[PDB]
Swiss-Prot record:
Family: Belongs to the Antp homeobox family.
Misc. comment: Loss of Antp results in altered development of the embryonic thoracic segments. Overexpression can cause antennae to be transformed into legs.
Organism taxonomic ancestry: Eukaryota, Metazoa, Ecdysozoa, Arthropoda, Hexapoda
Residues of the full protein shown: 297 to 363 of 378
Function, in words: Sequence-specific transcription factor which is part of a developmental regulatory system that regulates segmental identity in the mesothorax. Provides cells with specific positional identities on the anterior-posterior axis.
Name of the encoding gene: Antp
Subcellular location: Nucleus
Organism per entry: Drosophila melanogaster
Protein name from the UniProt record: Homeotic protein antennapedia
Recorded superkingdom: Eukaryota
Portion annotated as DNA-binding: 2-61
Length: 68
């Protein structure tokens, strides 16, 4: 059993997510199956970590704040 929300991930586990995200900032069905297996994570929690990793990119990266 796992409780979600509370990360409790290894630096390594998150490192492989970070190397994976750096290469590919969107994950496919197939690649998630590989990823889930690889880090013994689940696609749901990978979605959460990837969603976190791309928040503050795909909602800040350039984006002039005030329209003008």
């Amino acid at each position: 059993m796992r409780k979600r929300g509370r990360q409790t991930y290894t630096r390594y586990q998150t490192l492989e997510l970070e190397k994976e995200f750096h290469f590919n900032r969107y994950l496919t069905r197939r690649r998630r199956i590989e990823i889930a297996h690889a880090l013994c994570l689940t696609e749901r929690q990978i979605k959460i970590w990837f969603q976190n990793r791309r928040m503050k990119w795909k909602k800040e990266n350039k984006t002039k704040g005030e329209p003008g």
